[PDB]
Design a protein around this nucleic acid. Sequence first.
DNA 1: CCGACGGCGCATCAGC
DNA 2: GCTGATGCGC
DNA 3: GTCGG
Length: 323
Amino acid sequence: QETLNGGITDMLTELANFEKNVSQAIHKYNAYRKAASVIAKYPHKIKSGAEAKKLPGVGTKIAEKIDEFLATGKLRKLEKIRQDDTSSSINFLTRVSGIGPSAARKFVDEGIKTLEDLRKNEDKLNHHQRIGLKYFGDFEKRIPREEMLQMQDIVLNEVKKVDSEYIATVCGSFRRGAESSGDMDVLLTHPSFTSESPKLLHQVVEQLQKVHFITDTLSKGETKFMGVCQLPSDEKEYPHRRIDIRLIPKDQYYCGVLYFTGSDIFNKNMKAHALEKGFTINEYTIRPLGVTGVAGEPLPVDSEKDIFDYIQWKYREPKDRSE
DNA sequence: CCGACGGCGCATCAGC
DNA sequence: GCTGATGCGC
DNA sequence: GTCGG
Ligand SMILES: Nc1ccn([C@H]2C[C@H](O)[C@@H](COP(=O)(O)C(F)(F)P(=O)(O)OP(=O)(O)O)O2)c(=O)n1
Ligand code: NA
Ligand code: NA
Ligand code: NA
């Protein structure tokens, strides 16, 4: 419920962004995000820094910041950095996909501060950055679930057309049943591809380009594609969207699907459960741990269920994996 | 006090 | 031209 | 910045 502590969470999120994009302190970025998130879930309107400090992730300094915010309705440090031309410009440029803190700083140092300046300096942008600039606004839009379904329709159809033995699963928030998603993440496998066994990814990307669904490529190798797609349109045309496709060995596929469905909290919790049951699970495999902590060979996994069964957990519907 | 905090694929850079 | 590092975004 | 060994 935004209005509850929205001022605080907004404050912490802005601080997080400056740490990541300007100070290049990724661990402070994550600290602020963690604090913002735990506070976002706190079912009460916070009345003091001390009250917030009781939450894991909120420490001495953020408590102080909350006291200042509650007393004055702002934070001096944040007001200052907001009005800082160099800082605010660096922070802004990182909103372009492909421009990170390093590129943003370099651009701003040489007087390139706005999208207009970027537009004027194509020669100084790499391929990814040019695409990020081209679809700047579209990439910041969320994707309604209904469009995700139309997108899924196309992907599953074209994948099957290339080879009916491919298996493709759209993961991320969409598989968790979310009513909107930030992008589309497709996990792909094929019986012919295992850990102990190309063009499998290429043929799928190619077919999706052939029907004009994929419009641009950000990066592409033998196992990972990142690019851009658009649903077909006298109605207004759909925004361009980010799509990733990952080719994963068949024997590691379902660990992959589990992992890339998330959420992070759920993955963390399931990893914890697995441990106390004597198993180590990561993105790729689930392995038994010996009595001295030595990891055994990967266990056979032929479905998401197999994983749950190993750790004696009842199968959890993707829709029920927020925690 | 002081180290961990995720780490991997791909594009591109830096050094040789 | 090769190899490892870095930047970036998942 | 926060946590915890
Ligand atoms: N940087 C990352 C990100 C994700 N993942 C894996 C591990 C993650 O748990 C899993 C899902 O990512 P997610 O939960 O973050 C997300 F995308 F679905 P969400 O932002 O919540 O939703 P939405 O699309 O609406 O923005 O991918 C990862 O390994 N590394
Ligand atoms: Na705390
Ligand atoms: Na960026
Ligand atoms: Na960004």
